[PDB]
Structures are given as C-alpha cells and as structure tokens.
C-alpha cells in the first residue's frame, strides 16, 4: 500500500499536479506544516502535495519546519516523498535546464531542527544515530531516472557515457549537493571553495529534509533543478532571484512530467520489504535502547 | 548628500574620530544597538560612530546585535558604512601592522541573526535572497585604498606588482577573510585548513555585518587590521588577546588616518546612481513579492 | 592536592572504576549536569565519574550541557578531566581497536553553548578569547600515553617511528579530530571531504568539552576509541550504532586499565605550577578587563 507525498520548493510553490480531492490542515507534535496539505490521485495512487515555503513563499529555507512537514506526510500515510530543490551548478557539464537526481550531500546548515529525537520536551524520547552514507532511497532514485527515460527526457550517466554524449537538457544520474543555510547566495570565494571540494550543485533546502525522511522510515529522493551557474563564472551572469525563477519556469513542464510518471512507477511495484527495512533501520539506530 | 557610518571593533572601542555634535540611543525592530551612536562631521561630511562591542567591550563577537547596529545606521540616514576588523594573517606576505581592504569572504559563523527578513515577529516580513558574489561595494573599496595612498601609506597590489613591491607596513588591495564564530581562537589544525583553502585572514566580526549592510541598501567596505599570524607559525608567538591589542595600538593611528580621508573622499563624489542600484537590488531579491 | 574527573561517553555510560564513597547531585549557574557525580578513590587519588550522556544514554551529543558538566567538576575541586570519545577512523593507519591520544581538532559543531562568558544573563560577565593553538594539556596527554606504556599496549608515534612499527591494536601518540554536530552519521561525501583535509578521526562529543575545560582552568585530555572506519570504505560495512557498541565492548577492558593507571600517575606528581598557569591563562584572555 503506497502513497506518495510531494514537496515543492523554489519556483514550485504551487505544484498543481492533479485535481484536488481534499485538503487537510494538520498539526504535528513538532508544530504546524508550511501550509495546508492537498490530497488527490495519480491514477489509482494516492498523492499529497505540500509547498515547502508556503503558498505565498513567505518562509525562508532556514525557517521551514522540516520536521512538521515530514511528520505530517507520515501521519497522512505517505510511504514515499519526492522533493524538488532549485540549485546552482558548480560544474561545467551541469547547465541551467538540466536536472540532477542527487545521491550525495554535504551539510553546511545550522540552527535548523534536524532530528525528531532528543531530551527536550518538544522531541521524541531517545537518542537516534542514523547511518547516512547513502542518504537517499536508492530504489526511489532509480525510479526518478527511469521516469525521465519514459517521458523521452535525456539521461546522462557520467560513469558509462562520454561527456560528448551529455545531451542538454538532461537528467544527471548522480550528483553531490552542498546545502548552505541562506538566505543569501554564496560569495565567489565560497563558490570556488565548494568547487575545489568536488561538489556538483549548491542549494538551501535539501537538509535536514532528507535526514528527517529517513528518521520517519520514509523513502525519499530529490530532483534538483539547475537554474544557474552560481557565481563562479563571468559577471554576466551570476545568480539572482530573477535568474532562478526565470529558468525554473522554463523547466517546470519537465519537472511535472517526471514527478507524475514517478508516482505511477512507484505504485507499480511492491515495497513491503523496503518499508520493513526502513523501519528496522530506525529501531537499530536507537542507542538509548 | 551622503552620510558615513563607522563601526569599530577590537582595539577600536572608542574611535574618537571627531567632536560629537549629537548623541543618539535608538530602538530597532531587531533590538538595541551595541551602544549609544555618536553623530558629527568630518569636514562638511556627516558621520555616525558606533562601537561594535560597546565602550567597555563586554559584548563578544557572536552576541553582537549586527541587525540593530546596521539598521540603526540606516534609520539615521547613512548611505555608507566603513568598518574595521582585527584579524590574524594566514599568509606570508600579510604581516602584523599591515591592513587589508577585503573583497571576499568565507562564512563559518553560526547562531547569529544574519538577515532582516523572515517569518518570525523578530524580523521584517518577506524572503530576501541577496546576491553576494562580490559582497562589498567596489567603489567604497577603491576609496579606502585611495585614502591610504593620499596619506602616504604603502599600497600593495599583487595583481599589478611583484612581490618585491610588498613593503611593510602596507595596505593590501585585495584579500579574502574567513569569519569564525569565536570566542576562542583557532586550533593549529583549523589554521592550516583555512590556509590550505587559500584564505588570507581570519576574523570574528565581518559576517553577518557585511551581508546585513547590503540588505539595508548601504555601501559597505571593511578595512582589516592584521595583528598577528594566527597560530600557523612558531610558538613564539601564537595569537592571544595581549598580542592583538598590542599591535592594534601600534596601528590605530594609520587606521584613523585612512578612515577620515575616506570619509572626505566619499563626500567629494556623487552617489545617486549607486545608491539607487543598492536599493533596487533589495526589492529585486524579494522572492515572496515575485 | 589533585582530583581527577572522568567523563565517559558512548559505550562508557557506566565506567565503574572504583567503589562509590560519595555522590553529588548539583545545580550549576548554567544548569544541571548530565547525571549524578560519583566520588571515590583510585589508590590514594581522589576521582569523580560523570557519564556525558547520562546513565541511560538519553542525552544526544548536541544537547549535552557541557557547561554544567565541566563547571560541576570544577566546583567539586577537580584539577584534571580525562574524557573518552567514541570515533570513526578517516585514515588507513587508524583501525577499529586503536586508541588515540588527541592533540588537535577541527570544529564543525553548532547550537551548543561553548563558553562560560558573555553578555546574556545565563553567562559570566566578560569577554574571554582563549588561545587554542594546542588545545589540550600536554602534560596530561603524556600521562595517558605513559599509562598505555605501563600496561604494555603498543604505542605508535608517527613522528619518531616508521609505518612498519604501526602494530595493532595500538595507542596513537597524536591525532586530529573533526567534531560534527550529529546526531546522524556522516555521508560518504562528507567522509571523503574530511579525509581530504587530513583529519584522523570523526566524533560528536569532543567540542566544546575541551574548550570549556580550558576556560575553567582545568587540565584536559581525551582518549578517542576507534570503533569503525566511518563510511569511506566497503559497504560491508559502514558505521552504525551496533558496530560502534560492539567494538567498544571489545576495547572497554583496556580503556578502564589505561584510565585507572592515568589517574594514579596524575596523583603521583606535583601540579602546583601547571594549575597556576591554567588560571593565569584564563585571566590573560579577558578582553573586557
Ligand atoms: N546558486 C544557488 N545557491 C543556492 N540556492 C540556489 N537555488 C537556486 N540557485 C541557487
Ligand atoms: N587570529 C585571529 N583570529 C580571529 N580573530 C582575530 N582577531 C585578531 N586576530 C585574530
Ligand atoms: N563514525 C563516527 N562518526 C561520529 N561519531 C562516531 N562515534 C563512533 N563512530 C563515529
């Protein structure tokens, strides 16, 4: 029994992926979600849509209640979460218009509530140390990639394909993301430092959303939308809000295609053991037990 | 017309740049500034002076209300902000006594209020994503450098001069700064890591002051005072409070000379377009309005 | 007169080093310590034991009241603190079972109270900028190392020895630690990034414990217990709670042996000048004065 939650970020404040059947305003032990949750179906698969920054985009990346958002989806019966993340490219072969199915990240966030467990009154009791070597649900990752293939969107795998075979616009089959706290964009100094470390893209919204999803025993995968080259290139042109929004509008049609096709693909498989494994991993990470 | 705000940090708790014409204690949407603001004139140019840590230096770098300080300067009508920052050198050619007109930074601060905008009652409403590729006002940067030339202080530009032209004490025409949260100084491990990343100096007070200045639509430039070699050199001697204060007292006369001349140079030019551009950049970065 | 406090972390919530002669529950100007402080003797040397995470390990690394723990030990009259820290290795020469007498660290923590001094009501008045070039008490470090020698445990000093002399299990005479906030473990991306920076181990509990100890004028030394290779090696296996606890159980007998000998060796020497130097360093770091 699968149900897919969808979290839309920058340039995707109103995903609008289906005819809305119902609307839930929920509360969690960790506070209220960013907005009301919109429910509907993709085929026979139940689906929930939630704007990360609220309908009017009034909530900045660092102030988003990631716990409430993830836990609200969990309470509504979601087994999977597909998320969108606008980003800047730190590499030549990743160009505006491309998408990246992330498989790795580096965390530079702070001051965000990043765990459901702890000793404070507003947390679940216990100490939870989750393994995060491969922080995403690999099965869900491959579904996003396969969804791109089915909708005739180019896929580039750096490990099996030459760079001359990278056909833009394309969905990159892997990549690492540095997550900064924001709300400001990076300096040129920080950009080149991130490049030197071999990172692929830079964003503000991936962490702790990906971490909390695993804590919730949910299968999570991110589709990163490349909207710019950050600021490591020429003055014409470095990243700004207008640039991010402009490119995202150009790419949003392919984003909806991939997501809708992904939800259908997830509902076409059995996830019994994977869900078992997701829950068992959480229990085995409790050190207080 | 222009009005230049001046913020003094470590070793500069009492700038004393002029005779006070007025004295102001203001409230701000983000709290109280570090201390009373001092109003006056440098020649015919209006100025406002504000110590970053208070006159008694009781407020540590991580607890300074950068929001209130910058916003207070904005409300009083400041168009520019000149700021001083004590720092340790991570490079051979930057030695104690030198100064750096920074052009870049890397942020390693945390737990500081770094933006005026958000969804909390403690902030203005909206979501602001400012560009920070070149985080300083370039025109104001060049004025600091020119001010040093006018006061017969050596100026070293690594991009146009050979290393032989690096004569100390000198003002470096460019440089990057890593801003650590403090209050402790860095370990040797951290020092060499910052050094390997290619950073020029390390400080505790630059960020988020520079970021907030741009958010407020102000032209901001920093002059960093190199007081030590951090701790990547010999045990005699590694950075400590006494070392920092000792060098800063030796360097404070050149600092005041540069600032006063810079204020005069600012008042000699027209800034209508730059100020317009600064303000328009704010509104164009409001994603909630877009 | 010396008094050695011992802070036990992961895999060492119950050090059990001596017969309980007394117990203190205290309230400190910065709040309550993690647990009751147990008092006794190692030979003729006064000793105090305090579990960093509480007896039931209910307090996560980021929520530990390091200020209260250190200050409570200071108020009992402790002159020294010996601490244990579970960690993952980032380098080939450091394998599970090895111990490391740390001499350096890189801080990547956030949201932790890392100083006793400030302008907030819950802090001591003043501005304290402590030198931290070599953050540990060197005399106390050498005692930990000598304690290992006394117990016929291999000691590997990479500065005076060859790579062929690195015989496992061994106590490394030096090492650098990156301290992450947790509670999650690192991603492979982060693991390789830390590795490329030349760091030896990764942990969650060293900072700000070491920093506050120096602020309090106490001699502090950490012995790190390598329980895994983090996640930069083979998929079978990467770090998890079960792996950490399993290896620590295999090492705990030797950890206790070293600590007991260390406490005795401390009490056998005169620390009058060192103690004065510890106090003087704090006073010289007050910028407000
Ligand atoms: N360059 C960038 N940095 C951070 N977040 C972004 N979102 C889109 N582009 C971005
Ligand atoms: N080495 C240093 N690190 C941080 N802040 C400083 N201020 C002066 N010297 C410094
Ligand atoms: N790999 C690891 N990372 C962080 N803390 C740890 N404690 C034990 N192993 C660890």
Residue numbers in the entry:
A (entry chain B), C (entry chain A): 3 to 291
B (entry chain C): 3 to 292
Quote the original article:
Furthermore, a comparison of the KM levels reveals that S. mansoni MTAP can use adenosine with the same efficiency as MTA, which is one fundamental difference between S. mansoni and its host and reveals a potential target for schistosomiasis drug development.
The Base Binding Sites (BBS) of two of the six SmMTAP-adenine complexes obtained (SmMTAP P212121 and S12T mutant) were fully occupied by adenine. It is interesting to note that S12 and Q289 are two sequence substitutions compared to human MTAP.
